[PDB]
Amino acid sequence: GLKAAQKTLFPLRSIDDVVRLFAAELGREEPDLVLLSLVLGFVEHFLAVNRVGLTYFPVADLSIIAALYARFTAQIRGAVDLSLYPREGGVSSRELVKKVSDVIWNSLSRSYFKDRAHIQSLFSFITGTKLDSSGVAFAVVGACQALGLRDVHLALSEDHAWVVFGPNGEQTAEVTWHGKGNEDRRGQTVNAGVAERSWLYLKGSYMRCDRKMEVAFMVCAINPSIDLHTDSLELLQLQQKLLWLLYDLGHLERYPMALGNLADLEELEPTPGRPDPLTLYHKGIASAKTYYRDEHIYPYMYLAGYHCRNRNVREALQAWADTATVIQDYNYCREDEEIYKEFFEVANDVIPNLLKEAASLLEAGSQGSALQDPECFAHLLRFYDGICKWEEGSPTPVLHVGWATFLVQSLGRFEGQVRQKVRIVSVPPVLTFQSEKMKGMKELLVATKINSSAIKLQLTAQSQVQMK
Ligand SMILES: Cc1c(CN2CCC(Nc3ncnc4sc(CC(F)(F)F)cc34)CC2)ccc2c1cc(C#N)n2CCN1CCN(C(=O)CF)CC1
């Protein structure tokens, strides 16, 4: 190709030219993933990587993009034995997916930063031979679409990516790395990570993308950051309009995190006549409830972060309680460290910041501060209960005295006569605990005075106090 089902369109000199290109591709039953990713990376390269690049908007000539397009396809088609990896039923094999994975893997530069920005698109792969972890997986999918394998698709969790294929559409295969120095099982199924109930594989409730959702992923993969303090407004606008395009077409229906991304963008710059950010946050959560058994963490974190920024403490605490209620039915494993850092920061930094803020107006007698709402205390309890339950059954522990220090300080923010309003009932503001650490603690939580040493011993599985 390109056989040129789409070849007005060019060149592209505005944000809206990129949108119409995507609108044309999303009407073909196979939207050209390689073409669209190349355009995105090109535009992002001259708006975020190099800017002197250009001032207004980078003009993408078809001659340029087609030259990069043909070098990617000529590579892929030059290195893999498509007929020898045949069409045993019209679907791909593990040997063919592994071979294509092998081709991308052996093309990357031996030395670079696996976490740099702006190395996620096929533009990065074709010009600098560098990709991040999830970019390698997407490059495999796009390479397979280039070969004609309409059964190879992108699988996504909240921190990892791989490929689904084979008999519609069960077969999974690792195609990229995850984390630093965790041995690579490329070609293997993900069913060991599903069986161990690690958050990295969402207990099997991971996203299985069609070609439209794969287009949505590369849109979310746009990084508008030019450095550490400034974003490219132009790139923020394009991601916003592209997500709103996928939105209206119905292609974010099964993409909870994409609705969070657009809601975050709407908060920065509202689009006239579009739903308010809160609407979209609830749409992402409802998407996770409907299609993935409500086992995703980020739909609620998206909402919790919005409520935290706007100082809706009760709604923020309830959204974090929901994150804990989801996390509680997983086992904490190595590879799950990214979600550990999120829970660690919320419990030991964000929530203490919010409660201390609410503690100050307690002496400034203005009641109505969230520290007098027993609902807020119930959500904080459900939050720690879900993390405790998360820890049980795990190969490695979660909680420690650093966790214990801020739990005690947080409980202490609530007056005793507010804490005592929460009804903790054992099955079999009303709350039910599921972790054994919190159940044994319930009387200590609603005491007139908070016994700091006792609760710390309860939470950290410590057995003994200092001898002296
Ligand atoms: C929205 C958000 C983010 C943003 N992230 C951006 C990247 C998103 N991923 C994805 N998004 C779309 N598709 C994919 S596919 C994939 C797997 C891969 F393909 F890549 F393998 C990942 C992924 C997930 C959400 C990070 C931490 C956050 C929150 C929200 C909270 C909360 N609460 N947190 C916790 C840390 N703090 C943040 C700032 N914060 C506040 O502003 C105060 F409210 C306090 C909390």
Ligand 1 center from residue 361 Cα (angstroms): 31
Q: E strand or H helix at 301, and its extent?
A: helix 298-309
CB atoms within 10 A of CB 32: 23
Q: Which amino acid is at 459?
A: L
Ligand 1 center from residue 152 Cα (angstroms): 27
| 136 Cβ closer than 6 Å to some ligand 1 atom | no
Minimal-distance CA residue to ligand 1 atom 36 = 342
Question: Distance between CA 423 and CA 435 in Å, rounded?
Answer: 16
- Show Cβ contacts of residue 259 under 8 Å, excluding neighbours closer than 6 positions: 247, 252, 280, 281, 283, 284, 287, 299
Residue carrying the six token digits 């214990």: 404
Q: Which amino acid is at 375?
A: E
Beta-bridge partner residues of 208: 155
Helix (H, G, I), strand (E, B) or coil at 411: helix
Q: How was this structure determined?
A: X-ray
Q: Sign of torsion, CA 290 294 299 304?
A: positive
Q: E strand or H helix at 172, and its extent?
A: strand 171-173
CB 212 within 8 A of CB 23: no
Residue 327 has which token pair? Answer: 């996390």
Q: What share of the chain is helix, strand, coil (3-state, %, to 5)?
A: 55, 5, 40
User: What secondary structure does DSSP assign to 49-68, as a single string?
Assistant: I-----SS---B-HHHHHHH
> How far apart, in Å, are the Cα atoms of 175 and each of 120, 137, 189?
15, 6, 10
| 209 Cβ closer than 6 Å to some ligand 1 atom | no
> How far apart, in Å, are the Cα atoms of 403 and each of 7, 324, 388?
58, 15, 11
Helix (H, G, I), strand (E, B) or coil at 79: helix
Q: Which amino acid is at 215?
A: V
Residue 458 has which token pair? Answer: 């309860």
Q: In what order do the strands lie in the sheet with 161-165?
A: 171-173, 161-165, 153-156, 207-208
Nearest alpha-carbon partner for 255 in 214, 300, 304: 214
Beta-bridge partner residues of 161: 156
| 214 Cβ closer than 6 Å to some ligand 1 atom | no
> How far apart, in Å, are the Cα atoms of 257 and each of 26, 65, 215, 328, 330?
20, 29, 14, 20, 20
Ligand 1 center from residue 298 Cα (angstroms): 6
- What phi-psi label fits residue 410: left (phi over 0), alpha (psi between -120 and 50 degrees) or beta? alpha
| 161 Cβ closer than 6 Å to some ligand 1 atom | yes
- Show Cβ contacts of residue 49 under 8 Å, excluding neighbours closer than 6 positions: 118
Minimal-distance CA residue to ligand 1 atom 43 = 305
Question: Distance between CA 228 and CA 451 in Å, rounded?
Answer: 43
Strands 161-165 and 153-156: antiparallel
Residue 315 has which token pair? Answer: 């709604």
CB 255 within 8 A of CB 287: yes
CB 72 within 8 A of CB 104: no
Judged on CB neighbours under 10 Å (0-12, 13-18, 19+), 214 is: buried
Domain that includes residue 443, residue range: 1-468
Pocket test for ligand 1, best of 132, 158, 215, 379 (most atoms within 8 A of CB): 158
Residue carrying the six token digits 């027993």: 374
| 160 Cβ closer than 6 Å to some ligand 1 atom | yes
Ligand 1 center from residue 69 Cα (angstroms): 31
Nearest alpha-carbon partner for 104 in 36, 157, 2, 176: 176
Q: What is the DSSP letter of 395?
A: S
| 134 Cβ closer than 6 Å to some ligand 1 atom | yes
> How far apart, in Å, are the Cα atoms of 436 and each of 322, 327, 391, 406, 432?
19, 16, 10, 20, 12
CB 122 within 8 A of CB 116: no
Judged on CB neighbours under 10 Å (0-12, 13-18, 19+), 168 is: exposed
Ligand 1 center from residue 302 Cα (angstroms): 7
Alpha helices in 2-150 (DSSP H): 15-25, 33-44, 62-79, 94-105, 122-128, 133-147
Helix (H, G, I), strand (E, B) or coil at 162: strand
CB 128 within 8 A of CB 109: yes
CB 172 within 8 A of CB 158: no
Question: Distance between CA 94 and CA 19 in Å, rounded?
Answer: 36
Domain count, the chain: 1
Pocket test for ligand 1, best of 120, 302, 323, 355 (most atoms within 8 A of CB): 302
Instruction: Provide the resolution (angstroms).
Output: 2.4
Ligand 1 center from residue 98 Cα (angstroms): 30
> How far apart, in Å, are the Cα atoms of 130 and each of 100, 122, 139, 214?
16, 9, 11, 20
Residue carrying the six token digits 């993933």: 33
> How far apart, in Å, are the Cα atoms of 267 and each of 12, 217, 280, 281, 448?
28, 20, 11, 11, 41
Question: Distance between CA 298 and CA 47 in Å, rounded?
Answer: 28
| 309 Cβ closer than 6 Å to some ligand 1 atom | yes
| 34 Cβ closer than 6 Å to some ligand 1 atom | no
| 313 Cβ closer than 6 Å to some ligand 1 atom | no
Residue carrying the six token digits 């993969």: 221
- Show Cβ contacts of residue 195 under 8 Å, excluding neighbours closer than 6 positions: none
Nearest alpha-carbon partner for 251 in 411, 22, 15: 22
Q: Which amino acid is at 183?
A: E
CB 465 within 8 A of CB 453: yes
CB 143 within 8 A of CB 71: no
Q: E strand or H helix at 156, and its extent?
A: strand 153-156
Minimal-distance CA residue to ligand 1 atom 3 = 302
User: How many residues are present in the chain?
Assistant: 468
C-alpha angle with apex 301: 300 to 302, nearest 5 degrees? 90
Q: What is the DSSP letter of 202?
A: G
Q: Would you give the end-to-end CA distance of the chain in angstroms?
A: 79
Q: Helices 94-105 and 62-79: crossing angle, nearest 10°? A: 120
Question: Distance between CA 139 and CA 152 in Å, rounded?
Answer: 11
CB 168 within 8 A of CB 161: no
Question: Distance between CA 175 and CA 188 in Å, rounded?
Answer: 9
Residue 205 has which token pair? Answer: 């409730």
| 304 Cβ closer than 6 Å to some ligand 1 atom | yes
Question: Distance between CA 173 and CA 162 in Å, rounded?
Answer: 6
- Show Cβ contacts of residue 453 under 8 Å, excluding neighbours closer than 6 positions: 465
| 156 Cβ closer than 6 Å to some ligand 1 atom | yes
